[PDB]
Amino acid sequence: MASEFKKKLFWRAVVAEFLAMILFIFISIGSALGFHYPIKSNQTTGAVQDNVKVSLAFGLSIATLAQSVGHISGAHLNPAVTLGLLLSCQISVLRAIMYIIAQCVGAIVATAILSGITSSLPDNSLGLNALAPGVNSGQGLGIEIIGTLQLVLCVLATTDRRRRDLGGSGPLAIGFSVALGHLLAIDYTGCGINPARSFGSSVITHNFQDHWIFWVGPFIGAALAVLIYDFILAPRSSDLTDRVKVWTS
Amino acid sequence: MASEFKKKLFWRAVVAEFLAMILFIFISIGSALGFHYPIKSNQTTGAVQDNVKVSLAFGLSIATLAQSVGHISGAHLNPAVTLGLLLSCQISVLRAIMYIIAQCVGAIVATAILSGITSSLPDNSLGLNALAPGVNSGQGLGIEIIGTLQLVLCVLATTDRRRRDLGGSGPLAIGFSVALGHLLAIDYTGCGINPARSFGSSVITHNFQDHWIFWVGPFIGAALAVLIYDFILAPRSSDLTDRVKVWTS
Amino acid sequence: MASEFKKKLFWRAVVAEFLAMILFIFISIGSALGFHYPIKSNQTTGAVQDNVKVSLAFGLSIATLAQSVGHISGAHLNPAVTLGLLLSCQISVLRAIMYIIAQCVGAIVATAILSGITSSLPDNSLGLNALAPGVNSGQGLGIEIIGTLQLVLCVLATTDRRRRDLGGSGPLAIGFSVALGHLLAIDYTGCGINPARSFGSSVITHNFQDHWIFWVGPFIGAALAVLIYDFILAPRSSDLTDRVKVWTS
Amino acid sequence: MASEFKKKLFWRAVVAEFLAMILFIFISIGSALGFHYPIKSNQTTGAVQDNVKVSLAFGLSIATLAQSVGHISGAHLNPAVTLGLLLSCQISVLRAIMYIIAQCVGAIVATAILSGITSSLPDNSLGLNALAPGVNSGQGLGIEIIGTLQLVLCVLATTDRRRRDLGGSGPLAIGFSVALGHLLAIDYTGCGINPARSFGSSVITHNFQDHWIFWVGPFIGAALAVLIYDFILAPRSSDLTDRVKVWTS
Numbered sequence A, B, C, D: 001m002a003s004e005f006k007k008k009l010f011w012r013a014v015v016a017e018f019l020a021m022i023l024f025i026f027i028s029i030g031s032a033l034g035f036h037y038p039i040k041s042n043q044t045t046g047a048v049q050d051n052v053k054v055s056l057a058f059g060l061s062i063a064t065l066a067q068s069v070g071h072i073s074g075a076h077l078n079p080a081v082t083l084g085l086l087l088s089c090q091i092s093v094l095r096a097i098m099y100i101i102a103q104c105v106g107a108i109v110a111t112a113i114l115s116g117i118t119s120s121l122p123d124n125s126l127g128l129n130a131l132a133p134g135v136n137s138g139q140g141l142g143i144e145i146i147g148t149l150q151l152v153l154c155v156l157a158t159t160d161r162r163r164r165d166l167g168g169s170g171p172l173a174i175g176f177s178v179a180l181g182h183l184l185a186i187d188y189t190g191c192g193i194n195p196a197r198s199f200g201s202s203v204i205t206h207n208f209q210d211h212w213i214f215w216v217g218p219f220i221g222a223a224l225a226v227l228i229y230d231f232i233l234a235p236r237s238s239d240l241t242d243r244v245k246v247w248t249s
């Protein structure tokens, strides 16, 4: 349907999806750069990053944001999730598209507002996702794939709809999945599992080194997610030709 | 209405809001100062603050307190939240006012009971909020603004009332928002996102250096919250003139 | 009532309350002593205790145990909680009594099973609660009082019964209250807020130095809890003489 | 019943139970090895493992996985849990069996996919469970027994079915039980409380030193679990001969 305020609701989503991504990145990357703050106009040694601190920053950002606007847009805030839904035929490409853009832009916008907030920092990488020393790049992409997979998979089961056994908070569970991802990937690849988030940093930093692994890995994981839930473990009893109909509306 | 025990309930709130703030500050700042405790009448080096420990101390204090008296007063415990509700026209100024005072006083009272509990500590700052070395003050206030924003925004969506899709604990979600805030702001500004909490420490310590950023930043974030939820993402279909009516009762 | 299996249910509680305390202490103190394990028949320096690790160990033990047997006995596992209920006239002294004993014994039993598990440790204090260097003993008891207070208060509101606005898990909330307590008191007094738990260690270690503060402090906090919830913030509209009736059955 | 798609559902479980174990181990052991990553073709000192990071990695993996496929197979992902259910006569041996195999294999498969992901690591133990220096082996098995016990016990109470007082998320609670286990056992035995998980590492590493303690300990704890819940604290009013019937179907 493309009439009356069916226009409104839609744009409100895209917009909520756009504003929410700003808070997400600002808060999360904002938390990650916080350890570089022993600063006092000097330059002697440095502090050790806290992986729990960062993983919770990202995960709780999502739990909170999903709780704050999840009813308005579905609180995707991540192309790997959106793409996950799309292939599940639960969303329209018009949506996927407009959303993934609101996402990358919000990231780009947020990652760029931090540059000013934390300008006073040296080799300010702005939390750019980079293959860590010792991680066999490429084959080191099994990390992003599994990290995004488990996430998208959680999102599909949590919004399955045929279920009546869910208990507790959908947001919190999805958020903990997001923290679970970083508890796994922070060390290896700095954890991306979210194309728009990786993208936002690599642009405001013009560093796109291997940046491709942060799209192919999640988008793949999403693919494995939709394949495993929708066809192996929890299949719909309807035919493909009809699911596809969702592609338009 | 201003009759019968409509007086009682009201004062019970203010009071619960006042007592709850005491536990809040005592527990939280109480946790933050705990790392300074390697003490043994000596003075050699010192321990490194734990940001997860502190962020959870604050967040769980709220989750717990919101659970303990949230039904009695709404468990605001924070002018930025109260102010957030007020502008949303969900509360009366008589309330906002009496509450924000119960808040600052509880802080002031709590921050002052700790002085005795932890008197045996050196440069006892009593967890006073201070711009960290390297944070471009002022423009370093985007931290408090975002930190309080995301919080107040969560509180507005969580108590939206038109919703029937909330699942899990409202308290816990709000509490995690409060921990999310510190996971972001502890390093930069010591995290305030709560005027009364900052205020309580700066008074029992007579240090009001830049203390203004801890009111303008949250109160602003609250403003951005109410603007984004009430007018951009989740608008009420009623007119302003009628919402305003709430200003009195 | 004291007929039929009203005997059974009762004893099943006491017993569940007794068995659950064993797991509690074993797991929690078990976690706390774990950092002393760099051991290799040598004796060079030592590791720094993790306060989040310990606070979660205790809190999640409770969340889990309250979830596992909370329907059977109410999952008190703590004289300060039991005593809290008793004064609230929600339990019978026959219960309070039989329970507090199942508690101290379980502690005593558990604290004593660890002695063997961790015998290979040096100055094995078995997690005994001790006033930390720098904490003005006595006036340093405001810690246990606030720590137990906030806890018991959460338990009273969470089982209030007149409420229909609770959402999420009662166990988890109470558990997080228990973790909140340690995030506050670990540094100062090693955190007790639970007479039976302190007691269990001080007996298998014959160290009762100031051990009194771990009964007077919590039991007091409980008192402040029942006073604040039952008479100031959430009063019952019934008279005292009738509540007292509960003292017997 | 062994007709129609009663075959399908069954295999879908086994399979979901098999795929879910892969993500579990990959993510969790994946997180545990992450601290060994300061690597830069050098070899100077090393980082200190984070026990909260690891405990949450395991626990949230379960919370997430139980949420993702718990409706399909029950999300056991652990012989000690399965075995726990079996003895409770809530599952068929045909199930227990096919499941425990899907488990060990998934572990074996996962533990083997990491070998490649983290090949670039030195004495890559692949998170193999080993008795820590100072832990009186054997009598040091009280750890695995208690760790698995508390877990299985939580799973039995959480799926009790006669209950109508559960609140919140069953998955999250079980997940926190899994994190609780590691907060206790990581230091002592590297925490197993899950035969298939220990097994998976010891095979891809051909190190089976004491590996027996990781079966006898959990399987025992499970036994103590089913004994305590099903016969001491929460008994069914039916006779044994009829429960046994479940052994077949």
Ligand SMILES: CCCCCCCCCO[C@@H]1O[C@H](CO)[C@@H](O)[C@H](O)[C@H]1O
Binding pocket: A138, A139, A140, A141, A142, A143, D113, D116, D117
């Ligand atoms: C339904 C059948 C499911 C089978 C699942 C087993 C998949 C095994 C593939 O492992 C992959 O090996 C690559 C190197 O060859 C790595 O680069 C990659 O990161 C890793 O993931």
Ligand SMILES: CCCCCCCCCO[C@@H]1O[C@H](CO)[C@@H](O)[C@H](O)[C@H]1O
Binding pocket: A105, A108, A109, A112, A115, A204
């Ligand atoms: C509707 C939002 C559209 C956002 C478009 C972003 C395009 C990419 C350029 O980003 C810019 O990067 C600069 C630093 O390099 C910042 O100083 C500047 O402020 C920021 O804008």
Ligand SMILES: CCCCCCCCCO[C@@H]1O[C@H](CO)[C@@H](O)[C@H](O)[C@H]1O
Binding pocket: A208, A215
């Ligand atoms: C189905 C959705 C597909 C989305 C594809 C968008 C990928 C993002 C593009 O990254 C680009 O990579 C180039 C190197 O390859 C860089 O030179 C360029 O500056 C950078 O912007």
Ligand SMILES: CCCCCCCCCO[C@@H]1O[C@H](CO)[C@@H](O)[C@H](O)[C@H]1O
Binding pocket: A113, A116, A117, B138, B139, B140, B141, B142, B143
């Ligand atoms: C509906 C439109 C929403 C647009 C949101 C983008 C806002 C960009 C403003 O960034 C602000 O820049 C200041 C310096 O100029 C910083 O001091 C301040 O902390 C930072 O927040």
Ligand SMILES: CCCCCCCCCO[C@@H]1O[C@H](CO)[C@@H](O)[C@H](O)[C@H]1O
Binding pocket: B105, B108, B109, B112, B115, B204
């Ligand atoms: C109904 C509660 C009213 C509280 C009013 C507080 C006013 C500010 C003064 O605080 C005082 O600071 C002293 C340390 O400087 C403490 O020694 C003293 O105990 C504390 O009271």
Ligand SMILES: CCCCCCCCCO[C@@H]1O[C@H](CO)[C@@H](O)[C@H](O)[C@H]1O
Binding pocket: B208, B215
């Ligand atoms: C709409 C709500 C407005 C609340 C305004 C209260 C602000 C708190 C006042 O702080 C004051 O700042 C001064 C410096 O400017 C200090 O000299 C003074 O000692 C300190 O108390």
Ligand SMILES: CCCCCCCCCO[C@@H]1O[C@H](CO)[C@@H](O)[C@H](O)[C@H]1O
Binding pocket: B113, B116, B117, C138, C139, C140, C141, C142, C143
């Ligand atoms: C309804 C009125 C509530 C008033 C609450 C304020 C209580 C102030 C008491 O502080 C107490 O001061 C003692 C030293 O004098 C400390 O030893 C003790 O630990 C500390 O808690």
Ligand SMILES: CCCCCCCCCO[C@@H]1O[C@H](CO)[C@@H](O)[C@H](O)[C@H]1O
Binding pocket: C105, C108, C109, C112, C115, C204
């Ligand atoms: C029904 C349970 C009753 C428990 C009574 C406990 C009384 C206190 C003595 O504890 C004992 O301490 C010894 C170490 O000092 C341990 O070696 C011994 O095993 C343990 O029993």
Ligand SMILES: CCCCCCCCCO[C@@H]1O[C@H](CO)[C@@H](O)[C@H](O)[C@H]1O
Binding pocket: C208, C215
């Ligand atoms: C209303 C409930 C009251 C419970 C009271 C029980 C308190 C526990 C007793 O501790 C005792 O303290 C003595 C020193 O004072 C020690 O010498 C003795 O060995 C030790 O066992």
Ligand SMILES: CCCCCCCCCO[C@@H]1O[C@H](CO)[C@@H](O)[C@H](O)[C@H]1O
Binding pocket: C113, C116, C117, D138, D139, D140, D141, D142, D143
């Ligand atoms: C219903 C009655 C329940 C009684 C529970 C008390 C059990 C005491 C057994 O302790 C066990 O002692 C062994 C050494 O002898 C240790 O190797 C083992 O790890 C430890 O667990």
Ligand SMILES: CCCCCCCCCO[C@@H]1O[C@H](CO)[C@@H](O)[C@H](O)[C@H]1O
Binding pocket: D105, D108, D109, D112, D115, D204
């Ligand atoms: C249906 C899944 C069946 C899995 C059977 C696993 C048998 C045990 C052998 O594991 C193998 O270990 C090698 C390293 O030693 C890996 O290089 C190889 O890839 C992996 O397969």
Ligand SMILES: CCCCCCCCCO[C@@H]1O[C@H](CO)[C@@H](O)[C@H](O)[C@H]1O
Binding pocket: D208, D215
């Ligand atoms: C009721 C379920 C019983 C499951 C029993 C399976 C136990 C796993 C076998 O471990 C084996 O231990 C041997 C040493 O004893 C090793 O030599 C051998 O390589 C290793 O594979």
